[PDB]
């Protein structure tokens, strides 16, 4: 009964329980730097930019793959 990591964009902690669990609330993390976020938010952010949302990062966590 202790919090899980929080999204880097919406700043609200993750979690998952007629779709009771939509795709946009699934976990996601860059495998090279391990900076997580939601699904919808990250798919939104990584369209106009190319850099990790968390500050002081240098990874380009879409162009790697």
């Amino acid at each position: 009964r202790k919090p899980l990591p929080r999204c880097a964009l919406c700043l609200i902690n993750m979690g998952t329980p007629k779709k009771l669990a939509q795709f946009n609330n699934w976990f996601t993390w860059c495998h090279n730097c391990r900076h997580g976020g939601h699904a919808g938010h990250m798919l939104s952010w990584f369209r106009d930019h190319a850099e990790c949302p968390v500050s002081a990062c240098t990874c380009k966590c879409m162009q790697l793959d």
Binding site: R1, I12, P17
Partner: protein, 302 residues
């Protein structure tokens, strides 16, 4: 403006309506001991997606919370209790119950997010309380730190939403007892970080009539605080800091009596520039200002 009347379907008078943080949901309470939650769709239809009995007496107010702590609500009622409700993965479950109250409970309001999950409650005997919840993931454990008495009988409370570091937490309370006396009816309580105790800061002694509702104004970058008080006429004050409890510089900026009745409720907008009053004539006015600090009118909307 335009009207979009909605069938609330309440057997008793509606006593409060409150909006959520994002502005998409809605909460209503009534003397029929029921609280309803309304959602809206892309088609602009307000439909109720929740209804349940919450107390054993008339329910006065209901307020929302920041959605960083989840979907949390609060309530106050005539049966001398206050409860906190939670939405879970879809009905609402009672999480706690505040019982320590000699007389009826009038108002309950939350606190700004930057200082945690706090609750303030006022009663009809004179005492006001401030609770807390140290673990934000265990909402069935509330502690009681402060307990302030304010002589007269309380009827309304309001926090200060200022998030500046230089502004100390401060809460203002006003009475609504109409006796043949002439005492002050609005008081301000600050909080000194050293003694770790709330204390009186200033009192507006120019108010000798009952007060029904008070409401601060969102700060959003200003260097002073603006307060609105609802009485036989609508009043607006301004307090500035100068340079122990802080001593302000109290002024006045408005005194309007375009209602020919007694004002009941006041409220501000999101930015903090337009007020919205409501009296016994059923007319909701709005009051803006100009660059010459003269407060004008902008609506007779009814």
């Amino acid at each position: 403006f335009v009207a979009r009347s909605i069938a609330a379907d309440h057997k008793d008078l509606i006593h409060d309506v409150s909006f959520d943080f994002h502005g998409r949901r809605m909460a209503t309470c009534s003397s029929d001991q029921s609280v309803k939650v309304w959602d809206k769709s892309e088609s602009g239809d307000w439909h109720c997606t929740a209804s349940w009995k919450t107390h054993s007496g008339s329910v006065w107010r209901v307020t929302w919370a920041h959605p960083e702590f989840g979907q949390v609500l609060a309530s106050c009622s005539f049966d001398r209790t206050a409860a906190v409700w939670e939405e879970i993965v879809s009905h609402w479950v009672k999480r706690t119950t505040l019982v320590d109250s000699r007389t009826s409970v009038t108002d309950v309001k939350f606190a700004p997010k930057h200082m945690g999950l706090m609750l303030a409650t006022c009663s009809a005997d004179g005492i006001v309380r401030i609770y807390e919840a140290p673990d934000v993931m265990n909402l069935s454990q509330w502690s009681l730190q402060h307990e302030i008495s304010c002589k007269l009988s309380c009827s309304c409370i309001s926090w200060n939403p200022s998030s500046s570091r230089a502004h100390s937490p401060m809460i203002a309370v006003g009475s609504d007892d109409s006796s043949p006396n002439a005492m002050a009816k609005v008081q301000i309580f600050e909080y000194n970080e050293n003694t770790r105790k709330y204390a009186k800061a200033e009192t507006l002694m120019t108010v000798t009539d009952p007060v029904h509702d008070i409401a601060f104004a969102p700060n959003l970058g200003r260097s002073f605080h603006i307060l609105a008080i609802a009485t036989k006429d609508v009043r607006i004050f301004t307090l500035k800091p100068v340079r122990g409890p802080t001593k302000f510089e109290i002024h006045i900026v408005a005194q309007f009596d375009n209602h020919n009745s007694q004002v009941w409720r006041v409220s501000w907008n999101i930015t903090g520039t337009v007020l919205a009053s409501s009296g016994d004539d059923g007319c909701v006015r709005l009051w803006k200002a100009n660059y010459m600090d003269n407060w004008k009118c902008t609506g007779i909307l009814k």
